[PDB]
Amino acid sequence: KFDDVCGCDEARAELEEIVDFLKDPTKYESLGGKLPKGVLLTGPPGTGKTLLARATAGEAGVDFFFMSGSEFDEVYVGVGAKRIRDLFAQARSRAPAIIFIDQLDAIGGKRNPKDQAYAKQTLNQLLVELDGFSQTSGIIIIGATNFPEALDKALTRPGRFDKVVNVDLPDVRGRADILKHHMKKITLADNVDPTIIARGTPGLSGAELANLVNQAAVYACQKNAVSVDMSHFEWAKDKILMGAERKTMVLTDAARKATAFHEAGHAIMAKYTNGATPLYKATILPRGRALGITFQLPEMDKVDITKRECQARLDVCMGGKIAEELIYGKDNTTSGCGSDLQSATGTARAMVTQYGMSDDVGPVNLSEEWESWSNKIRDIADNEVIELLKDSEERARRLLTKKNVELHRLAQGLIEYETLDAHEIEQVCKGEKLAKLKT
Amino acid sequence: KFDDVCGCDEARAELEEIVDFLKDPTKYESLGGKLPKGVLLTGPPGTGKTLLARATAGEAGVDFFFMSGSEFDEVYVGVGAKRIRDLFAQARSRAPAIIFIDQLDAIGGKRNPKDQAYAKQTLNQLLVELDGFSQTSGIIIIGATNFPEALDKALTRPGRFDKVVNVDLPDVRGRADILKHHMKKITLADNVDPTIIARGTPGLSGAELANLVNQAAVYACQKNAVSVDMSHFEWAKDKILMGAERKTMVLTDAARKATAFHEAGHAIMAKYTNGATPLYKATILPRGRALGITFQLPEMDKVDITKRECQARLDVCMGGKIAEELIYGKDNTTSGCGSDLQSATGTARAMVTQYGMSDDVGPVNLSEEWESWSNKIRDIADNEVIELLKDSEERARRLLTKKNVELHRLAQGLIEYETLDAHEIEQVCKGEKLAKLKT
Numbered sequence A, B: 001k002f003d004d005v006c007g008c009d010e011a012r013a014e015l016e017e018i019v020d021f022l023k024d025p026t027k028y029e030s031l032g033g034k035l036p037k038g039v040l041l042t043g044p045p046g047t048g049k050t051l052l053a054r055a056t057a058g059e060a061g062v063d064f065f066f067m068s069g070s071e072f073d074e075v076y077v078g079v080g081a082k083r084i085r086d087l088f089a090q091a092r093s094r095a096p097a098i099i100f101i102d103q104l105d106a107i108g109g110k111r112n113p114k115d116q117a118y119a120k121q122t123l124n125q126l127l128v129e130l131d132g133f134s135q136t137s138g139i140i141i142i143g144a145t146n147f148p149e150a151l152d153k154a155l156t157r158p159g160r161f162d163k164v165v166n167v168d169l170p171d172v173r174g175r176a177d178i179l180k181h182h183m184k185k186i187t188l189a190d191n192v193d194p195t196i197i198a199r200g201t202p203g204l205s206g207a208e209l210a211n212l213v214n215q216a217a218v219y220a221c222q223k224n225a226v227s228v229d230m231s232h233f234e235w236a237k238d239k240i241l242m243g244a245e246r247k248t249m250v251l252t253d254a255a256r257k258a259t260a261f262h263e264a265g266h267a268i269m270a271k272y273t274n275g276a277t278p279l280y281k282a283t284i285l286p287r288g289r290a291l292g293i294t295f296q297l298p299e300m301d302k303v304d305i306t307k308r309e310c311q312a313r314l315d316v317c318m319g320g321k322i323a324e325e326l327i328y329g330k331d332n333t334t335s336g337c338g339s340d341l342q343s344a345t346g347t348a349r350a351m352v353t354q355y356g357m358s359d360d361v362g363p364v365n366l367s368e369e370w371e372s373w374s375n376k377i378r379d380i381a382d383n384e385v386i387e388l389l390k391d392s393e394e395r396a397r398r399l400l401t402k403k404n405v406e407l408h409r410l411a412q413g414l415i416e417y418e419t420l421d422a423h424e425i426e427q428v429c430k431g432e433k434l435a436k437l438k439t
């Protein structure tokens, strides 16, 4: 049912006019309008594309044929074309039907006159079937895909795929709508306000919210409880944003002290730098595949990114290296740092090539066809990148030398306790002990 | 039939005169002429090729066998050639007939030394059947392909496919004729002038104008209207040129302020810049996947582009980031500007590599085989491009320095009054008040 697709109102509409166009044509086809020959659905993974298609097949009332985009090419030459001829043959052999081909990437790759062969023999047959010499009517076709630009230009033409519909990640309102829908059919308690969960999950799809509610319910029943409450939703939310924790893996005191100084370094570097994102939990329990992680959670779920925020992030990604390099001396820096060091490099490149934030290079886009530029401009670009990185390192140590006391105090805070909230990090920096258990 | 194909009157003339040959040969077989042995049809997607094939099949008054390039080549070896032999056996058997192999991209592939010994058997049979040893007369063949150069050289050889006919995207008058044709099924109002819309859609094929009319009609019938009128055509044309409207979005006032300053920058750089394309409406309502777009629009749809107009395009691309720099200081530049830069760089390269508009590079075409020139001239070229872009952005920055008052005036005129129009933009840039409510 179309009510099961909460959020993405435009896409649900733009299939819903097709459905109610089928149910009573004369309310729409009076002035000469007629059925659209095809809807395309594009967007990231896990947003509601296949869901919307299953809802259209549920509320339409006409015969609905579905196939993946990979059930065509078995191992000979000309087997896919035969299966499209028989697919549309069965399709037009009855009333106005709908034909949902899912994963349209697998037969939608654009044909390029360099090696075109038996490979593109299925696509040409689909093209001749959608809009060919013999004009049939009544057949609608719906196809989904993660990759709109890989598709041919002869598929995305009007007359074959009349309208294009993009289903992407929801915002806070639609997000709270999705949670309100999945908080049904679970024995909630009071205390549960889905707007609160929606404010704290920037950048989650529908599949991840629904998974949140599900494993929160299972965790509720496994504690022998009676109703689901904000502690459970908070737990599962942490299991999605950070990773499953592990209260095992016995390890020495020198190691856990070292990690305490590493994550202490990221935290202090991220809490006193103008432009950094707001802070979140900062543990040393090995959760996920990492040995402790300082997570940051935005609130206004931005789409763009300024320059000060890029430099602030670029400084957060080195507080561990500079931290343990200021405590344990220089010849004792380990090799774990390199991992997060990796990510810093990526940011710096986007600041120079794509986004255009270096005055020495210019306001030019060296990003795509990086291999077409000469060697001088790439020398200047890469030199600019490295200058950004080491400048950020210098800022980081200049700051961690004047915040030494908060560094040690917070290190002991992470070594006595295992985790810390945000304001718990603040008070542990100030020095007032927290109301909880020293593990 | 041939009156249904509005625009591309040359191809229409060729096929009209072929069918006119099949009507009364004596007007043409006096001086000894004989029919063309073949007509090929090339052009981009959606420009009316299969349509002309339908017209000639409908009016030729003789048999008309049609197939696709993919209805050959099933599992076993030598079945495609077999089907071609039987196709021309039926063709010879029936009458003076016509044969339409739609989508010749499949079987008309280029021959090369590295084909796997069985790919080009169908093609070779098609060649020994068209102008082989046992010559005959009475069979005409028509073919359609998007990729004329991707065809073998023995299919295009006169004797086989005498006439190479070139369907192409219409000009202004052609679009007027297409719209006037397709509006004959729409219950129209009296405020409809297709010349306006034809002047509004510079670059659309015939199919896109078709479903433009269709969606305008269907939208007219959603609003409980009585006749499709000009505002509806405006709605649908805007939908196709920019995308859906996406009414339901939560927008912090700082966000939509910053956006209004970005498109304010583009609009001013396109307003007072010599040679820039005349300005159409500039909105900040979140259309499609962009958060606001200023949309320029030409007048006389020329194909050439002078050097003045090119530099105008570069400046129009730099105006946005220059706006954010002038208002929010330099550190507060976002990453949305990347989508601007990526376009401008493109134009810059066309000014230097292929259009021949530089002084140090020369009057030479460095475009084709870019990877084959030396490393010195590519250094010179890329230095030239970088200089073009830098000079562009500095011109933009002092232009927006002189027009600061109008910049704030139009930014505030966009935070209020969503989606101004060009005339309305000029009224806002002086201080008038618009004859319409605020949102």
Ligand SMILES: Nc1ncnc2c1ncn2[C@@H]1O[C@H](COP(=O)(O)OP(=O)(O)OP(=O)(O)O)[C@@H](O)[C@H]1O
Pocket (backbone or CB within 6 Å): A004, A005, A006, A007, A008, A044, A045, A046, A047, A048, A049, A050, A051, A052, A145, A146, A178, A181, A205, A206, A207, A210
């Ligand atoms: N708007 C929504 N309302 C309710 N549930 C949603 C919504 N959007 C997504 N979901 C959840 O997402 C799941 C289906 O995801 P979907 O199949 O749409 O992803 P997808 O677009 O197919 O991704 P991929 O193309 O990578 O498979 C459902 O189980 C559903 O619970």
Ligand SMILES: Nc1ncnc2c1ncn2[C@@H]1O[C@H](COP(=O)(O)OP(=O)(O)OP(=O)(O)O)[C@@H](O)[C@H]1O
Pocket (backbone or CB within 6 Å): A127, A131, A154, A159, B004, B005, B006, B007, B008, B044, B045, B046, B047, B048, B049, B050, B051, B052, B146, B178, B181, B205, B206, B207, B210
């Ligand atoms: N010149 C025209 N006059 C009227 N209608 C047109 C014209 N050109 C295209 N159309 C519309 O386009 C449709 C068919 O387009 P056509 O099949 O010619 O594209 P095509 O040449 O096959 O492109 P492709 O080969 O990429 O599919 C028709 O249904 C018709 O409504």
Ligand SMILES: [Mg+2]
Pocket (backbone or CB within 6 Å): A049, A050, A102
């Ligand atoms: Mg799916």
Ligand SMILES: [Mg+2]
Pocket (backbone or CB within 6 Å): A131, A132, B049, B050, B102, B144
């Ligand atoms: Mg065609």
Ligand SMILES: [Zn+2]
Pocket (backbone or CB within 6 Å): A262, A266, A320, A321, A337, A340
């Ligand atoms: Zn780290």
Ligand SMILES: [Zn+2]
Pocket (backbone or CB within 6 Å): B262, B266, B320, B337, B339, B340
């Ligand atoms: Zn822009």
